[PDB]
Chain A
Amino acid sequence: SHMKDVQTETFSVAESIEEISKANEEITNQLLGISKEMDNISTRIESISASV
């Protein structure tokens, strides 16, 4: 049928939504590690403030 040129685009957006999903998950993982590291930096600055 005419569903050939439909198929060539419905293969690539499934190989691309997968990279979006993977990359958004990498951003989410990095964000939550930074959030932890930042909330530990807060403690260290507060310790410097106490010394002041």
Chain B
Amino acid sequence: VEEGTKLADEADEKLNSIVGAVERINEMLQNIAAAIEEQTAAVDEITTAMTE
């Protein structure tokens, strides 16, 4: 019961650490999303300036 209680609190930290790790992936993806959108706006205005 003691060996199983402390082994259960081994998985609890590892699952909590995956939430943290994946929200670091998410934090990087939200910056790539804004950057791709801003870059998409800039390339558009160039393709308009080249059509002019």
**A→B interface (CB under 8 Å):** 47-48, 51
Contact = CB atoms under 8 A, between A and B. Distances in A.
Instruction: Decide if the interface of chain A is mainly helix, strand, loop or mixed.
Output: helix
Contacts, number: 5
Instruction: Decide if the interface of chain B is mainly helix, strand, loop or mixed.
Output: helix
A48 B52 CA distance: 8
A52 to B, nearest CB: 8
Interface in B37-52: 49-50, 52
B49 to A, nearest CB: 4
Nearest to B48: A51
Contacts of B50: 51
A48 B49 CA distance: 8
